[PDB]
Amino acid sequence: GLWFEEGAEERQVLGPFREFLKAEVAPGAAERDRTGAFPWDLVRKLAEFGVFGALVPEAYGGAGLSTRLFARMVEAIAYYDGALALTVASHNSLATGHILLAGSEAQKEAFLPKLASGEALGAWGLTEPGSGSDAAALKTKAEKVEGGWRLNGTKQFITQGSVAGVYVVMARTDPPPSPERKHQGISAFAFFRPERGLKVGRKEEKLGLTASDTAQLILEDLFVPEEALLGERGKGFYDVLRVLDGGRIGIAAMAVGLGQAALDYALAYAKGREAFGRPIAEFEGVSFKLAEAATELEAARLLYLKAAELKDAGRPFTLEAAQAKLFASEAAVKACDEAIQILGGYGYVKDYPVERYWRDARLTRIGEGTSEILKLVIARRLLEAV
Amino acid sequence: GLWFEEGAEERQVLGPFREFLKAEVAPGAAERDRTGAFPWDLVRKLAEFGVFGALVPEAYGGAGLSTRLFARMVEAIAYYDGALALTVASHNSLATGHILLAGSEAQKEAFLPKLASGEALGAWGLTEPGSGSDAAALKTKAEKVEGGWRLNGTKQFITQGSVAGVYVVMARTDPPPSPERKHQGISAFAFFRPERGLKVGRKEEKLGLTASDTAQLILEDLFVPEEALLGERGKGFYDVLRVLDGGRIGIAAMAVGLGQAALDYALAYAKGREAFGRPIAEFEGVSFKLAEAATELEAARLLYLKAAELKDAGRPFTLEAAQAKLFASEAAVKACDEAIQILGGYGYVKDYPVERYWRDARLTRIGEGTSEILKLVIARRLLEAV
Amino acid sequence: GLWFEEGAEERQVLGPFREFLKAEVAPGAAERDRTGAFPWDLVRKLAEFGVFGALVPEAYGGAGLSTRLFARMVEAIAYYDGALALTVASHNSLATGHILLAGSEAQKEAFLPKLASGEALGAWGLTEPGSGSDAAALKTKAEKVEGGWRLNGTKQFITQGSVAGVYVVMARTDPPPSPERKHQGISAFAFFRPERGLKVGRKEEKLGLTASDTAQLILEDLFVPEEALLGERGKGFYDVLRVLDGGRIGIAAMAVGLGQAALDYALAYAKGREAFGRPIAEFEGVSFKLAEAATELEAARLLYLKAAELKDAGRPFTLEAAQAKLFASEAAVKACDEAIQILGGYGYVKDYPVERYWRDARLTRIGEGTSEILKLVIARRLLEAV
Amino acid sequence: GLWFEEGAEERQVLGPFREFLKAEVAPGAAERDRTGAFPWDLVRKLAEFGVFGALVPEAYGGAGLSTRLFARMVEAIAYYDGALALTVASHNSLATGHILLAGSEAQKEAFLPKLASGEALGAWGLTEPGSGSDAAALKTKAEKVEGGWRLNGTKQFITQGSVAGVYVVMARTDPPPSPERKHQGISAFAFFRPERGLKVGRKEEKLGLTASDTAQLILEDLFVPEEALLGERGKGFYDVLRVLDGGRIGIAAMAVGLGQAALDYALAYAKGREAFGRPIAEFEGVSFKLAEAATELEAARLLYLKAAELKDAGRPFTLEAAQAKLFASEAAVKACDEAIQILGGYGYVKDYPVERYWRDARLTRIGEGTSEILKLVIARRLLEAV
Numbered sequence A, B, C, D: 001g002l003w004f005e006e007g008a009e010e011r012q013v014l015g016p017f018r019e020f021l022k023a024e025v026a027p028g029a030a031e032r033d034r035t036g037a038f039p040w041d042l043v044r045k046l047a048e049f050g051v052f053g054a055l056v057p058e059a060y061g062g063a064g065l066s067t068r069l070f071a072r073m074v075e076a077i078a079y080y081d082g083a084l085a086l087t088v089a090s091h092n093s094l095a096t097g098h099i100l101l102a103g104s105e106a107q108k109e110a111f112l113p114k115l116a117s118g119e120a121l122g123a124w125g126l127t128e129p130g131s132g133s134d135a136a137a138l139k140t141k142a143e144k145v146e147g148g149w150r151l152n153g154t155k156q157f158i159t160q161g162s163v164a165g166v167y168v169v170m171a172r173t174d175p176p177p178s179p180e181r182k183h184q185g186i187s188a189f190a191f192f193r194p195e196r197g198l199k200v201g202r203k204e205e206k207l208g209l210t211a212s213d214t215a216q217l218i219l220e221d222l223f224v225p226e227e228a229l230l231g232e233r234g235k236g237f238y239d240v241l242r243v244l245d246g247g248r249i250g251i252a253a254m255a256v257g258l259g260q261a262a263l264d265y266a267l268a269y270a271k272g273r274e275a276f277g278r279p280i281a282e283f284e285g286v287s288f289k290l291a292e293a294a295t296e297l298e299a300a301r302l303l304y305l306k307a308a309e310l311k312d313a314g315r316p317f318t319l320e321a322a323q324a325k326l327f328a329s330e331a332a333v334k335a336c337d338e339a340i341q342i343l344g345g346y347g348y349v350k351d352y353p354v355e356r357y358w359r360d361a362r363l364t365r366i367g368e369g370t371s372e373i374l375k376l377v378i379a380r381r382l383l384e385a386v
């Protein structure tokens, strides 16, 4: 069909997928938000579908899907369970994506098959206690030893950090030429869950996405073989930025899914709830919110589809991925907040899903580049183009 | 001192009060947000101070404070514990306020002393499952019987609903002349916790203000004596509106307190957290948020002080109370959301208080008149004045 | 290349078109904004580009272009002269579009060739002094007489009202079945500039779009032949609604053009203007404004391209055209206001074009359905879909 | 009565003042916006009200009014004529205020009587073509010569620049110790309109405030006596900062006046204009805009009254004046834009005053410190307080 809508082939995949989500994922979303229990059962079931190898080429045991279709799949998952959407998006975009992007043929044959089947979930460790937005300020170090490297440092807020079977960690291998250029000298390392040298820190409770595994990683004299070095030594940061460009498309889709769920719930609610003798949807104070949210969410969807298209075409998309994530996350969180408002007192109670949608969506304005950082990324590119 | 700042007499009360809050209330705020355990210990300690009889005249065993001072006290409590602030604000403004406003000398001597000492917490039941914003659409009925009345109906989201010793419930005693004028025929009833006829429904879990008691009340053939009728029969709605005007000043103050706590935390954090070689407070993306929030919160404070002043002067303040609550709640929630953003990933974790500040403040845009309802109230008054 | 980009065919047309605009239209834009002198000379030259018969089939002497290409052409014109863009958009979308939509073969052969060549500009009269948003409340009457009709009424703010050679006027021919169905009974009439019966009222000075011809039309027992009736008698308002859907796509494009011009100017200015030792573009207070505007403008463009595509595909597009116009107009006006701010004092002086961009763009949130009306159109469609 | 209301004394002054404004100023406001003709006649009459020497002590021939009363007077003027309000505010706050602040007894006796009577209007020249927000980067030089100084430089956008009888110009007299301390070495010079050495450049057309005199000043080896030095040599910028604090209070009041005029007009219009069978004020899309604007404008007024009070009390008010100006200007411009929207097409025509209100108010977010600069001033004060 038309570029902006789901084509026949996309519907053939997404239609059945959405029914699976409604039947198997939706029922326990509220409970998972309360308990935080990692959904191993659903991971297993999704993995059997190839969801955890979505972007991985079929040659490596993956589904070989396009960025566009995978993004739509993430939106679909997020509509029913934000935590699961983050689990799926991060696994595919970050750890797996980085190995697919910079891995040698040997590394891709060793890691990709296990990641694509779900046998091994992937964790991507960039952020640290002292550095997030300024990611190049990381302090984890990698020193050269006989047979490989010795890693020492701490990673903060790592998704799948405690359940991962494969880890990709960024560490400094060489001194930076200057503080302005501290990105130089950083390398990436890919390795299977260590027998020793890696421990999970005190788990933090989160505002939302309860069931998503987020943990602190403490690396103490962790040994990794020579084959662990991912990409060229000291040039890992450029690769990190390319990985985040792709990851941002997934987060944009995640945001749209959560915002759409909130809008859909508010629309249905406003049509059935009456006040002053008529459905509240008849008051502009409610209908205008619905119209604005619907419009912004459609705009956000078009933006992430555009970014995905550029990536699928092998063209630069840094600016476009940033714009998509920025707009989708900001619009989605606003839509969720308006949905809470439309339900009134009921929007403040956990028996209804809207308060969870907001709590889950709220992280999309922070993860993989805060909205502030993205505005810098966007402005810089705009100014360069004069 | 100058009208807009705390005078010497106000500081004499608030200064020591704030230290008490820092030492006895602040320490357990996070735990109460997780467990929802009603703070009986703190209620007892505050009650000994007269906090639960703040507006009640000294003749009835109250503290006889001004609306202005009580509002500042609510802001102070909210700064450290939103749930406790709501408990204090609702008890004083609604149940107690309604009895003080419309009670006969006999009723005030019977109820006020117990409410002012905290021996009896007050619950005010207006809202029902089918009516909130359109409060005059309530369905609870009061039928005249020998010796008094028989009440039947359900109240929704009632603060102190399960722990109250005194209840004030609104019910229809006479048929409305028309749907446009359904407010006519509604009466208010004040009574001590019933030996029978009243039961607490399934408790709902909330987005925030966890430790604040919120319950559904089910009235089944509840008998109340003739002396229970509060105000004139069928004219209780006008009184309800006057009670809400006063209550809105307290909620405005509550919002300001929560927003100020968020701003203060973000300011301190931004000064100590460094990125790209400098405190993040040095980046306009952060400092502009701080400046805007500080400015809006000060404006909100001036607005609630103005409303309080008018009430203390015995002058109309419906428009002013609505403006104060509308602006304070909207500004406070925005400030809290910006504080989450400034802390970044840390703003999304429960080890820090900012995510709780937002969750607690979020109800202020809904309770005692949603922002939408308040805009209607304000616009109507503006248009009447031409 | 990709759907959202200009295709090979589009570039071959838009490339030289833009060159013409920069050389012949841009130079006098500022002067026209000051004098309001209608650009008859530019109209003649533009007519050569197919621009005054863009959507009219080649059979009737038009250019036979797609809605998508025409929309891009309107954005291009708007980038350099907002008044000219409105002249082109209205002529094509309203008067011409209505005749193309409901005209009989005889009417199309008689009117379209003259409109499509620019020899006769078209004016569309719907709005009246007492009705705009509530367009079906028009009072202009059309009484049936021997061999035709006699029209009496006043039309307000009609584009091309004083310079038009062809007029399309909506007038009531039959009584409305009920006040709720007042849209029934309205007919459309197409006719050439009469010798009498039509006079132009006191010209009003406008905030922007100075050179765009806007006038009040006073119909005084204006006679029109039987052949003047456009569409089915009493079904004129239905055609009007269809005409507005198409028109809104053009206004959305117009808005994007003006907003893009403001953004581009602000970007160039911020890169060259220094303060405190560096380009002001290096301060986030400035760069964040630029990033947000750019993000919203690109979403707005995607929205109008989507609406144009649906129209070209013969599919429903009422909802989509409303979303495009609403989003684009609101985003463009904000971007223009931000540009004024970025230029500081220079943004307040007419020597620079940004203040004009805002004044011109400001009408896009009002014309062809105010933003408020569009939110209603949007909400209704969303709710009807359940 | 209450602090925030007009006191007995204020009403006795403002009552007749407002009557004068409505009778003598309001009638020609629209015409002056079209012609830009400086209102010399109104200046003479206003001078009678003490308005051109409002803050000047009676000893020096002034009115000896409080900052609070003067601020209310500026709001009153702005309500009817924005250009006149700027003329009064700038004359009083800048040129006159600077001489009153740093002038010696001899300078005050020589300048103030003439400025305070309106016989000599005052121009304050700080801004230059290359420096505005970064005011300390001024390039105008003051070389020491026999019996005085010789000034060379260009001043940009100077209010009263071409009609002033007294000029206060900032020029560098000594080299800056370092680029970071460039504010040191700047001096102020007060002098009467010279016979040569000062010429007015090409007048620029403005977006609004048409009748306000604004001009570029070219100083060409302009000689001024030793007595021209205002304040301590090289310490002129410190006085400049103090002058701006006071000026910002006046601009805040100006903004409130314009915003209030727009709000009042929109309220009256919405009550009388009907659509779809009822006053448009009955649609929340319109009434919510009115309620928000009214709420923000009253907060803005409270903020400027607070700042004025602190100044009158001899207490610090830098932070407060910045907050007042920032809030008032932003709120007023938004209210004016909403008024344009509420009038629909009529809001876009000059026959109605709302488009002028917006154009006039728009400068308040730029003059005497852009909103961006004010947020910096605010943030710095907040952070210094820890």
Ligand SMILES: Cc1cc2nc3c(=O)[nH]c(=O)nc-3n(C[C@H](O)[C@H](O)[C@H](O)COP(=O)(O)OP(=O)(O)OC[C@H]3O[C@@H](n4cnc5c(N)ncnc54)[C@H](O)[C@@H]3O)c2cc1C
Pocket (backbone or CB within 6 Å): A090, A124, A125, A126, A127, A131, A132, A133, A134, A156, A157, A158, A159, A160, A206, A209, A214, A363, A366, A367, A368, A369, A370, A371, A372, A373, B273, B275, B276, B280, B283, B284, B285, B286, B341, B342, B343, B344, B345, B346, B348, C284
């Ligand atoms: C639930 C969750 C899951 C996550 N999963 C992963 C993961 O799987 N892998 C991984 O590596 N990381 C992960 N993260 C970390 C996340 O990427 C970082 O939190 C984020 O990139 C930076 O946030 P921060 O906490 O470092 O805040 P900071 O970087 O300290 O920033 C704090 C505030 O300062 C602002 N700021 C900083 N610099 C500037 C500037 N120059 N201009 C303007 N504003 C600025 C920021 O926008 C923010 O508002 C996760 C975080 C969370 C909460």
Ligand SMILES: Cc1cc2nc3c(=O)[nH]c(=O)nc-3n(C[C@H](O)[C@H](O)[C@H](O)COP(=O)(O)OP(=O)(O)OC[C@H]3O[C@@H](n4cnc5c(N)ncnc54)[C@H](O)[C@@H]3O)c2cc1C
Pocket (backbone or CB within 6 Å): A273, A275, A276, A280, A283, A284, A285, A286, A341, A342, A343, A344, A345, A346, A348, B090, B124, B125, B126, B127, B131, B132, B133, B134, B156, B157, B158, B159, B160, B206, B209, B214, B363, B366, B367, B368, B369, B370, B371, B372, B373, D284
């Ligand atoms: C934690 C909590 C504590 C509370 N405590 C008390 C208490 O102590 N005592 C008590 O009596 N009640 C209490 N309430 C109830 C509260 O007052 C009501 O929820 C509120 O007044 C109305 O909300 P609602 O749930 O009825 O939503 P509704 O009234 O159904 O409204 C839903 C949405 O429609 C909007 N809307 C409705 N009408 C219009 C209109 N005409 N125009 C535009 N928009 C409209 C509302 O603004 C809202 O966005 C409490 C609620 C909560 C959540």
Ligand SMILES: Cc1cc2nc3c(=O)[nH]c(=O)nc-3n(C[C@H](O)[C@H](O)[C@H](O)COP(=O)(O)OP(=O)(O)OC[C@H]3O[C@@H](n4cnc5c(N)ncnc54)[C@H](O)[C@@H]3O)c2cc1C
Pocket (backbone or CB within 6 Å): A284, C090, C124, C125, C126, C127, C131, C132, C133, C134, C156, C157, C158, C159, C160, C206, C209, C214, C363, C366, C367, C368, C369, C370, C371, C372, C373, D273, D275, D276, D280, D283, D284, D285, D286, D341, D342, D343, D344, D345, D346, D348
């Ligand atoms: C420069 C210019 C060119 C124009 N050219 C043409 C033309 O070529 N042909 C033509 O026929 N007309 C033309 N118009 C008129 C334009 O179409 C109308 O102005 C518009 O459709 C309705 O605006 P109005 O002035 O009637 O405002 P109103 O309809 O009176 O509305 C006033 C305010 O009330 C709001 N409002 C009204 N109803 C509701 C509601 N139900 N809910 C919420 N808000 C509501 C509106 O949004 C607006 O904010 C032009 C106008 C201008 C200024």
Ligand SMILES: Cc1cc2nc3c(=O)[nH]c(=O)nc-3n(C[C@H](O)[C@H](O)[C@H](O)COP(=O)(O)OP(=O)(O)OC[C@H]3O[C@@H](n4cnc5c(N)ncnc54)[C@H](O)[C@@H]3O)c2cc1C
Pocket (backbone or CB within 6 Å): B284, C273, C275, C276, C280, C283, C284, C285, C286, C341, C342, C343, C344, C345, C346, C348, D090, D124, D125, D126, D127, D131, D132, D133, D134, D156, D157, D158, D159, D160, D206, D209, D214, D363, D366, D367, D368, D369, D370, D371, D372, D373
């Ligand atoms: C009608 C009018 C009357 C005036 N009257 C007077 C007068 O009487 N006397 C006088 O001396 N001047 C006067 N001015 C000038 C006015 O004071 C200056 O324009 C203003 O102080 C600075 O604006 P600028 O044009 O220099 O913009 P710039 O200083 O170049 O700033 C341009 C943009 O960059 C932003 N910016 C700059 N630095 C930063 C930063 N560090 N962080 C974030 N953003 C930044 C600004 O906010 C603005 O958005 C007047 C101007 C006008 C238009």
